[PDB]
Amino acid sequence: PVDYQAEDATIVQGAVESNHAGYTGTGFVNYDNVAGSSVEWTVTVPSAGTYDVVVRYANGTTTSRPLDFSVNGSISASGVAFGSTGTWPAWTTKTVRVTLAAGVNKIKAVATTANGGPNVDKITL
Template sequence: MISDLELLKVLLDNTNNAIKSAYLLFAPKDQIQSLDNYYRIAVTENRIQELSTPKHTVFLIDPSAETICEAEDSYIYNTVIKSANANYSGIGYVDFYNESGSYIEWTVSAPYEGTAILNFRYVNGSTDNRPMEIEVNGNVLGILDFNTTGDWTTLKSQTITADLNKGTNTIRVTSKATDGSPNIDYLGITMVRSTPYIYGDLNGDKLVNSIDFALLKIYLLGYSKEFPYEYGIKSADLNRNGEVDSIDFAILRSFLLGIIKAIPVGAT
């Protein structure tokens, strides 16, 4: 346990006494276990440029309950971790600077591919709605207005649904205003359903058999431009590389012959 650590260490330039870099620690000292828990802030020309955690958490999503992903344990850019206002969870919340482009990015691991509810717990004590861009795995889902909560201690939720991949996903919320953003306490993630299709089922009959094999062959030969099922393209992508090709044909053949036991490739 570190007991005598200063909460603020500023490195001064010996020539002009200007701040060149700083390290800020926002967690209470009795919660600090190691240097890996420090939050770092870079200061250039007396202006804060970036704040991030040296090691951010990969959150494992519970398939049966909401998973709480604290904002202070994520990767953060041009933001600051604070604990001045009450009612936050964890050790604090993330406060955005008045600058468009500041963001929080969570890295999460989903137990399966499917749809999730993203619940952003926030506070906005200003009188204005504050827009934030929501991005999942590099794809922008849209802009959400984080409405006023009346003060800086009353928390509310803003939600959006998103499709998550099995395994690692990134979820980013980015400020789109220059006059302030909401304070973010945490991101809650609830898986609501698994993939709405069965890999290899190209006609939607819930079976994977020789009919699907024939449909895939016809598609690859160019006799058909689509499958008789709205999820046909996705369910035919058996190696999940974004394309339907001869490799998927070989995988389906091997599955039907019993050479491989599960599809898509990598499933258990």
């Protein structure tokens, strides 16, 4: 049951920020508000199979901000909606099923809409 901080991951069109309370680690990733913004985590698991990946995020708007999840090149979850949390400090979790190989994997979450992604604190699996 391991935490992988977003601010420690590979960030494309985003910024490590810390101005909303409740994040874990040293901060969170604020996705740029464009399609294509992404965070990519390097994770390690002991066995091949499908893992529950718990995404901790916030969305202080009324519009869902969908992400596509992929593992080392291949789609894992398409159009996962990240709906309102009301305020930016009100972190919530959503579980996404991802199939992994034994050992090291990269899990990428890319924003598919012009609003970019929710703010993302971490994933846990």
